[PDB]
Every structure is written in structure tokens, then in C-alpha cells.
């Protein structure tokens, strides 16, 4: 009978913003509600547990409310960090049942704030003796999205944030490669909306 709903299914936010995650449940006869965080392909970590009679609970930058009669819970995350990127799951335990009934989760991504963008596309050659290389699109700001290729023989990854922690430096990147003859890093990301000032380097 119990149906637990989470919206939004997916959330992308700039680092530093507060954020709001919603949980709904059709049956108010709950005993508690628990929020978890999941790093995908691993297990869940309990974040907060709110008793049916409690209205709130907080832990560090995390705060959650419960309105059992409305069948709602809200999770608030203050000053988001890229390390908050994860799946956030809501679950309820019912009166006179031991099991937790889970929602489907919110997939959260906190995009890094890029201080000094320097967008460029570089060609990288195999360390092992071969004809192989890849194209690296890097140093673009987090507003830039990396699209898939018009050509199906061309492989392009989604964007990815790395953190050079000691340098207080974060950077975005995506990788493209292909076995086809006419493939070049100058054209690899042609279908993406990229900055006009993107740097394309000359002969190596």
C-alpha cells in the first residue's frame, strides 16, 4: 500500500548553493523516516533519522523536516560541495512492520565553481607503442555541457570534475576517441556548444 516518491529524480546545482530534496509518502501511519546517501555501486550511509513524533533533525550541513500528516519530508543541504554528489534516498518504516520502504532516489550533482576557465582540446598519445590517441576537452566552466557525437564511430564521455586539492584547483574534462581515419581533436567535440575562445593547439 505504501508509496514513497522522491522529486526531483535528478538535480544539478552550482557548488555553494543550498539545495532542497523532497520525499512524499501516501500512507501517514509511519513509525520513522530515514534519509540515506549512496555512492552508486556501493551501500547506503544513514544521514538522518526522524521519529514519527519528531518534526526535525540536523547533522552538520544536513537538515530534514517531517510532516507525517501531510505525508512529506524535506531534506536541506547547505553550502553544497562537489563531494555531496551522490544518490539521496528516503525511506519510511510503518507502524507494525519492521521493513523500510524506499523511494527511488534523487541523483544529485554539485558542479564545481571554476575560478579561471581555460577551455582547450588537447591530443594525447598512447604511452605504449601504437597509433592510438585520445582527445581531451578540459578547463571549461561548469555551464559548458559535453554532447554526444553526430557520428556513432566516435566515443565521447560525459564531463567529469577532478580536484587538485593541495593547489585548491578543480577542473572539468571529457574525453573523445575513435578508430576512424578522418577523426581529429579539432573536430571531435564539434557537436557540443563550446566556448568560442576554446584553445586548439598547433603541431606537437
Amino acid at each position: 500500500k505504501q508509496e514513497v516518491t522522491q522529486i526531483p529524480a535528478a538535480l544539478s546545482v552550482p557548488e555553494g548553493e543550498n539545495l532542497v530534496l523532497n520525499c512524499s509518502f501516501t500512507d501517514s501511519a509511519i513509525y520513522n523516516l530515514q534519509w540515506f546517501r549512496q555512492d552508486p555501486g556501493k551501500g547506503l550511509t544513514s544521514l538522518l533519522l526522524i521519529q514519527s513524533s519528531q518534526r526535525e533533525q540536523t547533522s552538520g550541513r544536513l537538515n530534514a523536516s517531517l510532516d507525517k500528516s501531510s505525508g512529506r519530508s524535506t531534506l536541506y543541504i547547505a553550502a553544497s560541495q562537489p563531494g555531496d554528489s551522490a544518490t539521496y534516498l528516503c525511506a519510511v518504516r510503518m507502524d507494525s512492520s519492521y521493513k523500510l520502504i524506499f523511494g527511488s532516489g534523487t541523483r544529485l550533482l554539485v558542479r564545481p565553481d571554476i575560478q579561471n576557465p581555460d577551455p582547450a582540446v588537447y591530443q594525447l598519445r598512447d604511452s605504449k607503442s601504437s597509433d592510438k590517441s585520445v582527445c581531451l576537452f578540459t578547463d571549461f566552466d561548469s555551464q559548458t555541457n559535453v554532447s554526444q557525437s553526430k557520428d556513432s564511430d566516435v566515443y565521447i564521455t560525459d564531463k567529469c570534475v577532478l580536484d587538485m586539492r593541495s593547489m585548491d584547483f578543480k577542473s572539468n574534462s571529457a574525453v573523445a576517441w575513435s578508430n576512424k581515419s578522418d577523426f581529429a581533436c579539432a573536430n571531435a567535440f564539434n557537436n557540443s556548444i563550446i566556448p568560442e575562445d576554446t584553445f586548439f593547439p598547433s603541431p606537437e
Partner: protein
């Protein structure tokens, strides 16, 4: 201190039996089995209070059985596995006094039609561009793992024999080498970025390691290629002075 599960992965052919073991946090009287598929939330399997199995998903097949003989550890057995059994199998425990659930890292079950589609990754490391070095005074290495199936891999970076996390990022999901087909092999990339000065020291050693969770030694294999067993495939680069 934490919930433990053995094994981390298991590939199985249809019809085979599989057994997972879970060890709760010391003395926790309550133990739960759940399973989860990608993009969704956990679905309840069974509940134990000490040794007794008090609640079980009404819809779950009789092929699924769990036991917790002395309390403490519990096993989950699936008989004659079907493709639909494919999921992460999660174990959780709770103490009698608090409602907080503590989860294990999970047991990933992939039940396949035929084992001939199973392939380990090939791995290659691509060295930093001289143009990147000139432009940014930084140096990005790329590791690419290609042609693996199913997608049971963990990629890690090792700098001079030490695992690094700083300056690393790995694609959240592998891409399909043929996005249409159901049994397409996969590819996954990762970047490691270091200072140009670090890259330019020829004594510095960079290794990308890809752990593949594949077939066991009890699995039957009659193909000419190497049995795609659980393995590590790696590639490496050394710094270059310029």
C-alpha cells in the same frame, strides 16, 4: 565496526545456485536483506530478529532463502538463478535500541544468458600533451579501459606505488561501444592531473589499474581465448624530461 558481505561480485549463468554471506555490526539483533537495480531504490527481501525470520517479501520467489543460524551472520541463497535475479544484493543491520540501519557494500549479481559474451578490459594510458604543459603548466594523463563485459570494473591510479585520489576523476558510468545492442561491450575513462614539474621528472611512475570482476575457476570454459576470470589489467607511463 562495519557491515561485511562476501562476495563483492558474482557472475552466474542461468540455472546455477548462488550463496551470499552477510556479517552484521557486532551484536546487532536485527538484520535485513534488500536488492537494488540501477537508477532505482532498494526493494525489501527479508528481516531477521536474532535467528528468527520475521518478515519476507510476499512476492519474492521460493528460490530465495535466507538463514541466520546463531543470529550474527546470515546467508542468502538463490537457487536456479534467472536473469531477472540480477541486482545489487544489500545487507543491513540495526541494534534493538535505535532505528538506524547500517548497510554493507553489497553483492553484485549478474546472471547472464551465455558466458561467451564475458570479456575483460584492455587498458591504455595516454600521456600529457606538450601543448597542455605549455598552456597551463599542468599535465593530464588519461586511462582508457575498453571492450569489457559486463561492466564490473574498478579503476584506480597509482603514483610511485601509492594510490592517489587527488587530481583524479573517473567517468560516473561506462559508455556502450554499441549503444543499441543489449550485449554491447563497455568503455570507461579516467583522468589524473599533476603539475608539469611532476610529469617532467622521469623517475615518476604512473600506473592505471583496472580490476575486472569476471568468471570464477569453477565456471566451465571451452572457448579458445583466455577464460575471462576476475583479474587486474593495467597500463603505465613514466615522466618525460622537457
Amino acid at each position: 565496526t562495519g557491515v561485511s558481505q562476501n562476495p563483492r561480485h558474482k557472475i552466474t549463468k542461468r540455472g546455477q545456485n548462488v550463496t551470499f554471506r552477510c556479517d552484521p555490526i557486532s551484536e546487532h539483533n536485527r538484520l535485513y536483506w534488500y536488492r537494488q537495480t540501477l537508477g532505482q531504490g532498494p526493494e525489501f527481501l527479508t528481516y531477521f530478529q536474532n535467528e528468527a525470520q520475521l518478515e519476507k517479501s510476499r512476492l519474492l520467489s521460493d528460490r530465495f532463502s535466507a538463514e541466520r543460524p546463531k543470529g550474527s551472520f546470515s546467508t542468502l541463497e538463490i537457487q536456479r538463478t534467472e536473469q531477472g535475479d540480477s541486482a545489487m544484493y544489500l545487507c543491513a543491520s540495526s541494534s534493538w535500541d535505535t532505528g538506524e540501519l547500517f548497510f554493507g557494500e553489497g553483492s553484485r549479481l549478474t546472471v547472464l544468458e551465455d558466458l561467451k559474451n564475458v570479456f575483460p578490459p584492455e587498458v591504455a594510458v595516454f600521456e600529457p600533451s606538450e601543448a597542455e604543459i605549455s598552456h597551463t603548466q599542468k599535465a593530464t594523463l588519461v586511462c582508457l579501459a575498453t571492450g569489457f563485459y559486463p561492466d564490473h570494473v574498478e579503476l584506480s591510479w597509482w603514483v610511485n606505488g601509492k594510490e592517489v585520489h587527488s587530481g583524479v576523476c573517473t567517468d560516473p558510468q561506462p559508455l556502450k561501444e554499441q549503444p543499441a545492442l543489449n550485449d554491447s561491450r563497455y568503455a570507461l575513462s579516467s583522468r589524473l592531473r599533476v603539475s608539469a614539474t611532476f610529469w617532467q621528472n622521469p623517475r615518476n611512475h604512473f600506473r592505471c589499474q583496472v580490476q575486472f570482476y569476471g568468471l570464477s575457476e569453477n565456471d566451465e570454459w571451452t572457448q579458445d581465448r583466455a577464460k575471462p576470470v576476475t583479474q587486474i589489467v593495467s597500463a603505465e607511463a613514466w615522466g618525460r624530461a622537457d
